[PDB]
Amino acid sequence: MVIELTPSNFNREVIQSDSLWLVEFYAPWCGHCQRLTPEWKKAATALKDVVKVGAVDADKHHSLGGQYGVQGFPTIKIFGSNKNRPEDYQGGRTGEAIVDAALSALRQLVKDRLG
């Protein structure tokens, strides 16, 4: 349900995708990330087959952590129409708040495609 993202699959899964993606950049040892885990799963399940929801261990994969300016954890990004310019998510860390942000991002995505 939450797609595990790594340097090896990030391009294929996210960058080359026309799906809306939410990506959590986390560290396993981080208490804040640990508390987010169930809420991230909650969002991923609510968004099944609507929005793709992934997670990068940015503690391990510093390459990806460095690329998206991850200085601390969790860092949440929204990958919309321009996959080269993700938006930083600064909303609430509940599944409910994340889902609302995803819906807003979808509205923006489809409206831009329409023109």
From Swiss-Prot:
Active site location: C30 (nucleophile), C33 (nucleophile)
Superkingdom to which the source organism belongs: Eukaryota
Effect of C30S: 50% decrease in enzyme activity. Abolishes enzyme activity
Subcellular location per the Swiss-Prot or TrEMBL entry: Endoplasmic reticulum lumen; Cell membrane; Melanosome
Residues carrying Phosphoserine: S104
UniProt note on tissues of expression: Expressed in platelets (at protein level).
Function: May function as a chaperone that inhibits aggregation of misfolded proteins. Negatively regulates the unfolded protein response (UPR) through binding to UPR sensors such as ERN1, which in turn inactivates ERN1 signaling. May also regulate the UPR via the EIF2AK3 UPR sensor. Plays a role in platelet aggregation and activation by agonists such as convulxin, collagen and thrombin.
Name of this chain's protein: Protein disulfide-isomerase A6
Organism field: Homo sapiens
Residues of the full protein shown: 27 to 140 of 440
